[PDB]
Enzyme design. Sequence first.
Site, PDB file in Angstrom:
ATOM      1  N   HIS B  41       0.846  -1.215   0.000  1.00 23.99           N
ATOM      2  CA  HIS B  41       0.000   0.000   0.000  1.00 23.99           C
ATOM      3  C   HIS B  41       0.877   1.259   0.000  1.00 23.99           C
ATOM      4  O   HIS B  41       0.399   2.283  -0.465  1.00 23.99           O
ATOM      5  CB  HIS B  41      -0.995  -0.051   1.163  1.00 23.99           C
ATOM      6  CG  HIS B  41      -1.414   1.303   1.614  1.00 23.99           C
ATOM      7  ND1 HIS B  41      -2.053   2.195   0.772  1.00 23.99           N
ATOM      8  CD2 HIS B  41      -1.257   1.939   2.790  1.00 23.99           C
ATOM      9  CE1 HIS B  41      -2.291   3.321   1.418  1.00 23.99           C
ATOM     10  NE2 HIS B  41      -1.806   3.192   2.654  1.00 23.99           N
ATOM     11  N   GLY B 138      -1.324   5.573   9.995  1.00 26.14           N
ATOM     12  CA  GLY B 138       0.148   5.450  10.034  1.00 26.14           C
ATOM     13  C   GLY B 138       0.641   4.190  10.737  1.00 26.14           C
ATOM     14  O   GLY B 138       1.865   4.023  10.879  1.00 26.14           O
ATOM     15  N   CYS B 140       0.271   1.031   9.763  1.00 27.96           N
ATOM     16  CA  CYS B 140       0.402  -0.131   8.848  1.00 27.96           C
ATOM     17  C   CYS B 140       1.879  -0.472   8.739  1.00 27.96           C
ATOM     18  O   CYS B 140       2.683   0.460   8.713  1.00 27.96           O
ATOM     19  CB  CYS B 140      -0.210   0.160   7.491  1.00 27.96           C
ATOM     20  SG  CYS B 140      -2.003   0.104   7.577  1.00 27.96           S
TER      21      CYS B 140
HETATM   22  C1  TG3 Z   1      -2.481   1.709   7.564  1.00 29.00           C
HETATM   23  C2  TG3 Z   1      -2.091   2.661   6.428  1.00 29.00           C
HETATM   24  C3  TG3 Z   1      -0.830   3.471   6.590  1.00 29.00           C
HETATM   25  O1  TG3 Z   1      -0.182   3.527   7.580  1.00 29.00           O
HETATM   26  O2  TG3 Z   1      -0.438   4.118   5.430  1.00 29.00           O
HETATM   27  C4  TG3 Z   1      -0.037   5.448   5.546  1.00 29.00           C
HETATM   28  C5  TG3 Z   1       0.577   5.766   4.173  1.00 29.00           C
HETATM   29  C6  TG3 Z   1      -3.974   1.970   7.819  1.00 29.00           C
HETATM   30  C7  TG3 Z   1      -4.513   1.405   9.146  1.00 29.00           C
HETATM   31  C8  TG3 Z   1      -5.905   1.731   9.417  1.00 29.00           C
HETATM   32  C9  TG3 Z   1      -6.075   3.230   9.595  1.00 29.00           C
HETATM   33  C10 TG3 Z   1      -7.200   3.339  10.356  1.00 29.00           C
HETATM   34  N1  TG3 Z   1      -7.106   2.136  11.358  1.00 29.00           N
HETATM   35  C11 TG3 Z   1      -6.338   1.163  10.828  1.00 29.00           C
HETATM   36  O3  TG3 Z   1      -6.084   0.099  11.305  1.00 29.00           O
HETATM   37  N2  TG3 Z   1      -4.629   1.249   6.744  1.00 29.00           N
HETATM   38  C12 TG3 Z   1      -5.531   1.882   5.788  1.00 29.00           C
HETATM   39  O4  TG3 Z   1      -5.779   3.045   5.860  1.00 29.00           O
HETATM   40  C13 TG3 Z   1      -6.149   0.972   4.717  1.00 29.00           C
HETATM   41  C14 TG3 Z   1      -5.480   1.164   3.376  1.00 29.00           C
HETATM   42  C15 TG3 Z   1      -5.455  -0.059   2.471  1.00 29.00           C
HETATM   43  C16 TG3 Z   1      -6.705  -0.916   2.521  1.00 29.00           C
HETATM   44  C17 TG3 Z   1      -5.244   0.407   1.045  1.00 29.00           C
HETATM   45  N3  TG3 Z   1      -7.542   1.339   4.608  1.00 29.00           N
HETATM   46  C18 TG3 Z   1      -8.501   0.990   5.669  1.00 29.00           C
HETATM   47  O5  TG3 Z   1      -8.129   0.417   6.609  1.00 29.00           O
HETATM   48  C19 TG3 Z   1     -10.003   1.382   5.547  1.00 29.00           C
HETATM   49  N4  TG3 Z   1     -10.809   0.142   5.483  1.00 29.00           N
HETATM   50  C20 TG3 Z   1     -11.440  -0.120   4.211  1.00 29.00           C
HETATM   51  O6  TG3 Z   1     -11.602   0.809   3.518  1.00 29.00           O
HETATM   52  O7  TG3 Z   1     -11.724  -1.421   3.735  1.00 29.00           O
HETATM   53  C21 TG3 Z   1     -12.987  -2.061   3.743  1.00 29.00           C
HETATM   54  C22 TG3 Z   1     -14.138  -1.129   3.377  1.00 29.00           C
HETATM   55  C23 TG3 Z   1     -15.279  -1.103   4.182  1.00 29.00           C
HETATM   56  C24 TG3 Z   1     -16.329  -0.249   3.870  1.00 29.00           C
HETATM   57  C25 TG3 Z   1     -16.245   0.566   2.738  1.00 29.00           C
HETATM   58  C26 TG3 Z   1     -15.107   0.531   1.925  1.00 29.00           C
HETATM   59  C27 TG3 Z   1     -14.056  -0.322   2.238  1.00 29.00           C
HETATM   60  C28 TG3 Z   1     -10.497   2.227   6.710  1.00 29.00           C
HETATM   61  C29 TG3 Z   1      -9.618   3.482   6.834  1.00 29.00           C
HETATM   62  O8  TG3 Z   1     -11.842   2.548   6.447  1.00 29.00           O
HETATM   63  C30 TG3 Z   1     -12.812   2.383   7.447  1.00 29.00           C
HETATM   64  C31 TG3 Z   1     -14.078   3.183   7.140  1.00 29.00           C
HETATM   65  C32 TG3 Z   1     -13.166   0.909   7.461  1.00 29.00           C
HETATM   66  C33 TG3 Z   1     -12.315   2.880   8.816  1.00 29.00           C
END
Ligand code: TG3
Lengths: 301, 301
Positions: B41, B138, B140
């Site tokens: 990612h 942040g 991940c």
């Molecule tokens: C780690 C990313 C990072 O550090 O990168 C910085 C460059 C984060 C960790 C998340 C942040 C919030 N809490 C955590 O554990 N990971 C992400 O942001 C994910 C990115 C990859 C999937 C590309 N995105 C999410 O975790 C996202 N979930 C999601 O969208 O997936 C399923 C979904 C469910 C419903 C609708 C669409 C998709 C989070 C941010 O979204 C929510 C709404 C689920 C919180």
Amino acid sequence: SGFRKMAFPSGKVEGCMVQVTCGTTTLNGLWLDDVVYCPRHVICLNPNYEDLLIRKSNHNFLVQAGNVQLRVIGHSMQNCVLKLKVDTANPKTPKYKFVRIQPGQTFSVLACYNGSPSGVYQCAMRPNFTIKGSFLNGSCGSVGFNIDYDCVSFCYMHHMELPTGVHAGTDLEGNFYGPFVDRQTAQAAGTDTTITVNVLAWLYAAVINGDRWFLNRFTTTLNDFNLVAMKYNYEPLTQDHVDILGPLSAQTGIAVLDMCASLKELLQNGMNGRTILGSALLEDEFTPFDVVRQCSGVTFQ
Amino acid sequence: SGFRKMAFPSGKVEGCMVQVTCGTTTLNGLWLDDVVYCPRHVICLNPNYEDLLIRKSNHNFLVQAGNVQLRVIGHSMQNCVLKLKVDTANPKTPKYKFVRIQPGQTFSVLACYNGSPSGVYQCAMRPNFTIKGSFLNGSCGSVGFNIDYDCVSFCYMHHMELPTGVHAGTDLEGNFYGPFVDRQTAQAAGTDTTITVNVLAWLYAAVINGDRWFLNRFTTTLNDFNLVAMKYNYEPLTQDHVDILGPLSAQTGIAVLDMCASLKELLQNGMNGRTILGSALLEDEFTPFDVVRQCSGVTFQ
Ligand SMILES: *[C@@H](CC(=O)OCC)[C@H](C[C@@H]1CCNC1=O)NC(=O)[C@H](CC(C)C)NC(=O)[C@@H](NC(=O)OCc1ccccc1)[C@@H](C)OC(C)(C)C
Ligand SMILES: *[C@@H](CC(=O)OCC)[C@H](C[C@@H]1CCNC1=O)NC(=O)[C@H](CC(C)C)NC(=O)[C@@H](NC(=O)OCc1ccccc1)[C@@H](C)OC(C)(C)C
């Protein structure tokens, strides 16, 4: 998001942990700079340490940091702690402070055996100057700490268990928390109380993490809250505890007395089988600062 | 004595944690030997990483271990993980394994931001291949691990949160736990279950720590236990889970089916307001091995 019982990373403390044997008696010591700190119990119903200490010499103390033996070049006692001066300054000595904490404040424990770290968990200094730890034979000299900025604030050194399966220990100047002595004469902690301000801090963590069912339309005065709280063996809430709940109040837009009103209803009517952050009890081992660190402060690491 | 949610010491893992930026996108990586491992990612609704990856060069990757910059001399993708080959072998690389764990198994999380460790807590792989973590923007590239002997068994790398405030991630070969993808298309975990064998392990920890009120004179067959357990959303107990409860049974002299009989009564009649190891819920994030490690194994550290 999410809310866990979160400890500080233990690495800076693992680098200070050494084994201390006096003759054939062995426990854990803390190696900062010139000095190793450990419970004076290592030099032994009702012992006279002052005499046992003088009757000892620097060759009666074997200190090992892993493989390496540290040459002990002097020994001194301060309160319930032994200080051994050694040839070598610990090159992994972090920035640190010795801090004496108040009941209600939380810290991380690095449980150690044979001078080797075996586990980490989060504790609170209980109102009765006990901690609810997990400690076996050989754990003494295990330390409690907060990592305040870049800086390890050491607050606890483990000394003993009381008959209730609870634990007692000193600050790093070797003064006990609460009215306890490092001798095997019958002592007891006496009745504990719930840490009101920490429970409210944790209902604020629950709201921040979107757990909101317990909130109600009502409000309360401080005295009407305490009148109910003290019936359920909660510390009275003080204006100063209302004060340090201010930042969590503003973030959530829930006034402290409105959260008090929600807490009052929970205590009188119970949970109805529901949970709050996956708990069926109100948790009191998170402080205001703990909530802000885990829910946001942590991202600036 | 005492029973806490105990994590492994994090030091060996803190020594492997670095920051990885691709252009201006930043998260955590794991620096073992030649290689830094992080979520793919970092190189970015429905991205094509294969192409984004090739369109990149070694100067598009900035890796810092504290101050020091690590020169990236190659990049490769395996499943959902990026591997960056670097000039320098991590001189603090511990002995380690990559391990894929089963639902029910527990591990420690070192939550990291900007490549810096901010906290430790204990997790379980839930039956629905979720973990209940505490992770913000942040986080991940934060890893889960057990310390199996001298040896770090890395089992988890954090990738995402699902709408229930629960978390999903991969093994260190970058294969997701459960049916999840590293793209922001609607996914959901689906209903979880209680880990029967872990709850029984924790009723054994309670007895070892002298909490015995819930024990009864009765016994049960495996099928009569499961007939009640599955009504309360517990996994059926398997002969193999009875098997690995054997050593805790012998130590306590309480036969597994007698503990089953005690568990059956707790589920049908509730706690009556009583607690077990200071809990009002039956806890399922301690395995058999976890009980033996904390209650004794720990003293041989
Ligand atoms: C780690 C990313 C990072 O550090 O990168 C910085 C460059 C984060 C960790 C998340 C942040 C919030 N809490 C955590 O554990 N990971 C992400 O942001 C994910 C990115 C990859 C999937 C590309 N995105 C999410 O975790 C996202 N979930 C999601 O969208 O997936 C399923 C979904 C469910 C419903 C609708 C669409 C998709 C989070 C941010 O979204 C929510 C709404 C689920 C919180
Ligand atoms: C650390 C000692 C060590 O590592 O030294 C090895 C050389 C241990 C930690 C204890 C072990 C069990 N769980 C712990 O947290 N500390 C001790 O053994 C204490 C020694 C000093 C006090 C000299 N002793 C106890 O903790 C003892 N408590 C006690 O005797 O004090 C109050 C008391 C109450 C009733 C009757 C007499 C005295 C423990 C071992 O005793 C029990 C019965 C309370 C468990």
